Homo-oligomer: A and B are copies of this chain.
């Protein structure tokens, strides 16, 4: 039963990532043969860099990548939903239903599930500050320490509003637009709007002018013998420094005094650069060099011979500040576009990476809420409500598709069970309580794992974007369907 094998692999992955769904998600550790260890709880990373020999499991890589690409939040929800769906799919094949009937029933169930989630979702305007804060805190939940939730949420909404580039209603709040720097120790209170891309590199030369107001900023990427007579070596050195003098002279004619180069340097090169007072940062990556080019306004000039004064950018200020331990050039005053890198502070490296992922997910969720403008109660409330209306449809429908739709409802309801289990509550009792609550007509009662009870989510500030849950259901459906659609593993000829 190769299908049983594939389902078992998907089940193993689903159970592995089940434990990391919620505020109290028990983190997982990623150890490799090199010995490096990273503590993470966002399921994206967990599905990213885990060893999977099984190819049916290896499809869930692509499922998670699609989820992150469209939605940016809800990979763990999608994988757990796929696990529960394949649970009930397996034991529906055990009863005797053909797999194609299961697929057809799941397709109908998920069409109606998306419709129901559209109906139940409560709308939100982009000016109700408390609702945006609630969305931000709910998504932000999972990975930060409990202390700095209010602070990071406040900074999230502040950055989203202040950097709100009104591009015809759809604000272009990109992940690489908001200004944070990474550094060990200190705290998260350095996630402020510093109008420029800050590089974690020291100045090459001490007497290099650290302060330069209205500096003429340039962006470069190029890397900055036969001897016959005794003085011929000195001659090659002389002409090399002469052509260096010529090129830096025509650079200075443009007026450039601040440079961030993509490649390395040499001691003599940086010395003669600092002779005139020129900043030079080396080994800047492709992505962050492009970001600096966008921010500073100086177009990247591979062939520097055609550099002109028109090609140069400008920055309001450049300053070297000894913040914390590491020395860095705190560039501030890049006035053309809001451009930045996803680099964020915390106490330790594990917490640094955790907070980086968490702030990224926070901006993703608030961006989705602003764009789509439909928010659904979280904490398992949406799942239970959709399961109830699916059971109503099952009462409407008849045949052996009703069994498949009931299976889909139970698989959807497995998410609140997991969310309660990770919170410490007993799963069956609180699940029955949620069902009883939703049978009384109200639809916002869920699970809030911070207080460890069942309560109204809307008054508890536990609300997730509608589109995130829609894409979670869709990705789980495609995962379960296309894992069910396989029959048997065969050796495929390797491309030569």
Contacting residue for A51 out of B20, B235, B492, CB 8 A? B492
Asked if B27 and A487 sit within 8 Å, CB to CB, the answer is yes
In the complex, chain B residues whose CB is within 8 Å of the CB of A66? 185, 347-348
Q: Does A101 contact B (CB under 8 A)?
A: yes
Q: Does A396 contact B (CB under 8 A)?
A: no
Q: Does A33 contact B (CB under 8 A)?
A: yes
- Taking the closest CB of chain B, its distance from the CB of A452, in whole angstroms, is 8
Asked if B58 and A37 sit within 8 Å, CB to CB, the answer is yes
Asked if B28 and A146 sit within 8 Å, CB to CB, the answer is no
Could you say which of A117-125, A127-135, A222-230 contacts chain B?
A222-230
Q: A226-B227, A490-B50 are in contact. Are A29 and B56 (CB under 8 A)?
A: yes
In the complex, chain B residues whose CB is within 8 Å of the CB of A63? 348
Q: A482-B39, A486-B39 are in contact. Are A31 and B55 (CB under 8 A)?
A: yes
Q: Does A303 contact B (CB under 8 A)?
A: yes
Which residues of A, 461-496, contact B by the 8 Å Cβ criterion? 478, 482, 485-495
Contacting residue for A29 out of B30, B348, B486, CB 8 A? B486
Asked if A99 and B39 sit within 8 Å, CB to CB, the answer is no
In the complex, chain B residues whose CB is within 8 Å of the CB of A53? 35
Which residues of A, 289-331, contact B by the 8 Å Cβ criterion? 299-300, 302-303, 306, 325
Asked if B70 and A28 sit within 8 Å, CB to CB, the answer is no
In the complex, chain B residues whose CB is within 8 Å of the CB of A70? 185
Asked if A271 and B226 sit within 8 Å, CB to CB, the answer is no
Asked if B37 and A59 sit within 8 Å, CB to CB, the answer is yes
Q: Does A32 contact B (CB under 8 A)?
A: yes
Asked if B100 and A422 sit within 8 Å, CB to CB, the answer is yes
In the complex, chain B residues whose CB is within 8 Å of the CB of A56? 29
Asked if A27 and B486 sit within 8 Å, CB to CB, the answer is yes
Q: A26-B99, A50-B490, A228-B226 are in contact. Are A302 and B424 (CB under 8 A)?
A: no
Which residues of A, 404-435, contact B by the 8 Å Cβ criterion? 422-424
**A interface residues, how many (CB within 8 angstroms):** 89
Q: Give complex CA distance A206, B311 in Å.
A: 14
Q: Does A239 contact B (CB under 8 A)?
A: yes
In the complex, chain B residues whose CB is within 8 Å of the CB of A184? 69
Q: A299-B206, A487-B26 are in contact. Are A32 and B492 (CB under 8 A)?
A: yes
- Taking the closest CB of chain B, its distance from the CB of A287, in whole angstroms, is 14
- Taking the closest CB of chain B, its distance from the CB of A354, in whole angstroms, is 10
Contacting residue for A303 out of B26, B239, B268, B424, CB 8 A? B268
Chain A, residues 258-281, CB within 8 Å of chain B (1/0): the string is: 000000000110011001000000
Asked if A485 and B37 sit within 8 Å, CB to CB, the answer is no
Q: Give complex CA distance A495, B53 in Å.
A: 16
Query: Can you list the 10 inter-chain pairs with the closest CB atoms, starting with the nearest?
Result: A30-B492, A98-B424, A51-B491, A32-B492, A32-B494, A49-B493, A37-B55, A24-B100, A27-B485, A271-B303
Q: A206-B300, A271-B303 are in contact. List 6 more A-B contacts (CB 8 A).
A: A26-B485, A37-B55, A50-B491, A101-B452, A225-B227, A226-B228
**Between-chain CB contacts (< 8 Å), 22 pairs:** A20-B487, A26-B100, A28-B486, A28-B487, A28-B488, A29-B486, A30-B492, A31-B491, A32-B491, A32-B492, A35-B53, A36-B494, A39-B482, A50-B491, A66-B348, A98-B424, A207-B299, A230-B239, A267-B303, A268-B303, A271-B303, A275-B306
